[model samples]
Target: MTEYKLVVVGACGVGKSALTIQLIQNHFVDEYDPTIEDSYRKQVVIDGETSLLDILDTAGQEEYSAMRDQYMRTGEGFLLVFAINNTKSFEDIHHYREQIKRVKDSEDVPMVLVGNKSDLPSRTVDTKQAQDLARSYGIPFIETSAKTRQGVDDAFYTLVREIRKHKE
Candidate 1:
């Protein structure tokens, strides 16, 4: 089986863990915190090939900045998450993307720009805005709601495909 090292990154309260949990546990976690760092393993089939996903739910707090470089170096693909209702969180996505590129020492890295919390009634980050940003990077953009399980699998599965394409 192929192993894909994936990382979930975003500002605090943007539902990184929520998204991760929904994918791994197949259920939504309404409340989650004390989430400095977590790693999960799941066996999944993508494109008819059995693959093992090593997912890292990374710390969103500023104090955990020191640890990012370590994981950034190892992550094969990243889910750059941001809350649709929080503009700051969306803005912070750029930094994470840049950091990962620097750590990987490559101009292009396999990643997905995820606008999480899509189930909410009110949102600050419009789909077009996020799409434009994703276009600038030439990466895939997806809006997801861990609560509703919308686009959750596509977000992660796309990254797996992106990784496979990058490797070739």
Candidate 2:
């Protein structure tokens, strides 16, 4: 079975890890125990074909700066995730996008920019701004809520479909 490597990245408390866990476990996990580098796998049906998705959930902790490039280098696709409530998290996505491009040595990499925690009443990052960023990179954009389980599955589903479509 061929595996599609995916990397999830964002700033601290931006729900990168939380969304990853939510996608796999259908719930949120954090704070008490931190994830330095966690990997998850699933067999998903994309475009009527069952494929393996291998996800590397990267660390956003300020100190551990060593492995980001390595992880980005290996991913076939990426989920650039951020919290809707944090403006810095939203703006900082560009840095992650550039870094990934540099590591991959190609701008044709498939990616999806995700705004997590959309269940919140107030959003610091406007939807238009987020959409603009995704548009600038010519990628799909989505918003998800780990708390309400909204858009979590669709986030993964859409990204994988895009990966397959781009590879073709």
Candidate 3:
């Protein structure tokens, strides 16, 4: 079986842990400690091949910035998430992208741009804007809701697909 080490990075309150937990546990986590580092492992069939996904839910708060480089080096794929209601969180995705690229020392790393909090009615970042940003990054953009579990699987699966493409 192939192992995929994935890292989830985003600004605080963007629901990084929520999304990870939702995927692993099939339930929504409404509350969590922002500074806690979380990791999960699951086996699944992606493209008919058995794969183990090792997901790291990194601390999103600025205080945990020191831990970023450590995981960035080991991670093969990344999900740069943002909240739809929080515009600043969306903007922070850019810095996270740069950080990942810098740490990985490659511009063509596997990644996905995830806009979370899709269940919210009010949105500050437009869909087209995020799409355009993803286009420029040459990555896929997906909107997800940990509460509703929308696009959660697709987001992670897409990142796996990207990793496969990057490997070839």
Candidate 4:
């Protein structure tokens, strides 16, 4: 089986763990404990292709800076998530992008910009802004809701497709 290290990075309370849980286990943790320097490993089969994904969920609150740096360095692909309802989280995407670049040392890695928490009706970040950023960075972007499972599959599958294409 092919293996991949997928990292999810974002500001605190942006629902990174929730998204990962929803994607891998098809369940949502309503009362998730804030991931204090924790990482997980799981295997998933997408389109009949089995791959092991070591998911690193980093704390967004800067207290876990060292751990975050370690996780970022080992990431094969990344899904940069931000809460649509939180403008501050959205604003931090630029910093996250730069950090990923510095760690990966390659601008060509497969990445997907994810606007999570789309189940909330009140959005502080506009879709156009997310799309524009994705376009500028040449990365795929999608808005998703872990609660409703909306766009979750698309987000993962899109990233997988990108990785496959690039690996070819």
Candidate 5:
């Protein structure tokens, strides 16, 4: 099986773990006890080929920022996440994208800009704003509700397809 290294990154409590859990395990937790950094490996079939996604659900706290470099360096692709309910979380994706580009030494690496927590009753950042920012990096953007399983698979599948394009 082909192994894809994917890293989930974002602001603290932005639901990175929840999104990862739902995508990989097919179950969503009402609440997650945070792990500073955690990894999961699962076998899945995409395009009729058995594939292994080795994913790291990363810490979003400020103190963990220093460790993100290794995540960027080792990743084949990234899911850059933020909560649509938090305006601050929506900010600074540019910095993260830039860091990824610098670390990877290529601005064209595969990545997806994800606006998580789409099930929230209210939102601080609308879809247009998110798409507009993602366009600057030439990356695809998607919204996901980990709790509802809405668009969660789409986000990861889009990213995995992009990563496959790199191999092709």
Candidate 6:
């Protein structure tokens, strides 16, 4: 069994935990827990291969910036998340990428730019814009919906495939 460390990052309430939960357990967390802090870890087997995904559901607010470096140090790949219906969340991608680069010391790390909450009817962030940003950064773009399970598995499977291809 080959193990991989994967991280899901985004501002709070952008559905980072929801995405992770859906991918790992095929479930969504409907209730919000204000007291939750820090990160969570889970081990999963995909295609009979064991991979450890350490999900860091960091606080969305600026105060949590102090721990950004610490959180970025643990992962081999990243799932950069943004909310499709929230323009502010979309705008934070650059800052998130910069923070990751600072900790990882490279711009070529494997990453997937995920536009979450696709189940919503109103979208504040355009798909083309997200794709453009991802293109500029040389990262794959995917739109996902944890609520409907749309593209949830696709996003992670795409990353895993990319990793395998890179290794080959």
Model 5 ranges off by over 4 Å: 60-68
Reference-based lDDT, residue 60, model 3: 44
Kindly indicate the candidate among 1 and 4 with the higher TM-score: 1
The TM-score between candidate 2 and the true structure equals 0.90
TM-score of 5: 0.91
The 10-residue segment with the lowest total lDDT in model 1? 59-68
lDDT of each: 0.91, 0.82, 0.92, 0.82, 0.85, 0.78
RMSD to the hidden true structure, all candidates: 1.4, 1.9, 1.4, 2.0, 1.8, 2.4
The collision pairs in model 1 are none
Per-residue alpha-carbon lDDT of model 2 for 1-168, expressed as tens digits?
467888887887877777877777676775524556788887777667787878888774654344666667888888999899999998889888888888888988889999998999788999999999899999999999877889987888888878888888
Per-residue alpha-carbon lDDT of model 6 for 80-148, expressed as tens digits? 899999999889888888878888887677789999999998999999999999999988999999898
Local error of candidate 4 at residue 142 (angstroms): 1.1
What RMSD does model 1 have?
1.4
Ranking by TM-score: 3, 1, 5, 2, 4, 6
Candidate 2 — worst ten consecutive residues by lDDT sum? Answer: 60-69
Which scores greater on TM-score, model 2 or model 4? Answer: 2
lDDT of 4 by residue, 5-104 (tens): 7778788888888888888789988867774646677677878988777777776366546666776888777888999999899889988888888777
Better of 3 and 5 by TM-score: 3
Better of 5 and 6 by TM-score: 5
Decide which is better by lDDT, 5 or 6: 5
**True-structure lDDT of candidate 3:** 0.92
